[PDB]
Design a protein around this ligand. Structure first.
Ligand code: WBV
Ligand code: WBV
Lengths: 132, 132
């Protein structure tokens, strides 16, 4: 798929919110635990992702996520325009006993996911570099 | 330089702590504002970085940062072994008026830094992909 396309969705576990960004073409995941499913958390996360990868267009499974002027101002500043969450939840459960805080298990599960095999982490750098 | 080498340092601004990871070979930056300069924040950040990039060895300008068993357990789980912060602070000041929270300005400054020109963001993906 096009190299700048990401999917962003907010999922739930242990009464906390996990935001999950997926690089559609590669399967590569950036994920974080946020305290509330607010547009402020979405806006700040978009700004983070955009600084780290070339984020051209964002998709979601909940369009209403992208309606706050907070979020749109982030889409604007960064030049952004407008399945996998059960795999990650699976890995979270596997490693969950290895950590106290859910936020630690999520990053353990992102590590596992992006490096298991190519690996998602290998495909995104190959994709983004080919495009360059 | 070798593709898995990162430098990690904790810098201060507005009475808050900014953790700054630099991909030595490319100049690419991941940075976050943390509430306290604790080993817990360092450990969790290392786990995050390692899931996102191939992090083989970490350097720092404060060795004592890496002495907690919390941090070493993270170095261990991820398979990690053991100048730029004034550039980023410069950009933070420039964009500071554009944001209320310092944490928003930091991600604005990471975005600016990694994409200005190649760009640091282009070099890290080229470096990491060449290695692959
Ligand atoms: C909350 C926490 N405290 C920790 C550690 C460790 C190793 C120690 C010694 N302590 C103090 C302690 C625990 N019991 N006792 C009696 C004293 C870890 C940890 C878990 C897995 C990895 Cl790879 C790396 C660190 C965490 C993790 O949180 C982060 C945010 C990552 C620090 C978590 O969420 O489990
Ligand atoms: C705290 C905050 N509130 C915001 C916005 C926006 C655009 C609106 C409308 N509001 C509510 C508001 C502000 N004044 N009034 C009277 C109502 C932003 C913002 C700033 C720059 C970008 Cl590109 C994108 C969003 C932020 C930023 O924080 C994050 C965590 C990023 C949300 C920040 O740190 O400035």
């Amino acid at each position: 798929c096009s190299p700048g396309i990401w999917q962003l969705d907010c999922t739930h576990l242990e009464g906390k919110v996990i935001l999950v960004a997926v690089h559609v073409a590669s399967g590569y995941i950036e994920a974080e635990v946020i305290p509330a499913e607010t547009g402020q958390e979405t806006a700040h996360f978009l700004l983070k992702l955009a600084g780290r990868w070339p984020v051209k267009t964002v998709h979601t499974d909940n369009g209403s996520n992208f309606t706050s002027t907070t979020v749109k101002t982030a889409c604007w500043w960064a030049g952004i325009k407008q399945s996998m969450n059960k795999e990650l939840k699976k890995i979270i459960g596997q490693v969950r006993d290895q950590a106290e805080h859910l936020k630690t298990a999520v990053q353990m599960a992102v590590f596992i996911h992006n490096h298991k095999r190519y690996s998602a982490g290998e495909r995104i750098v190959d994709i983004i570099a080919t495009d360059i």
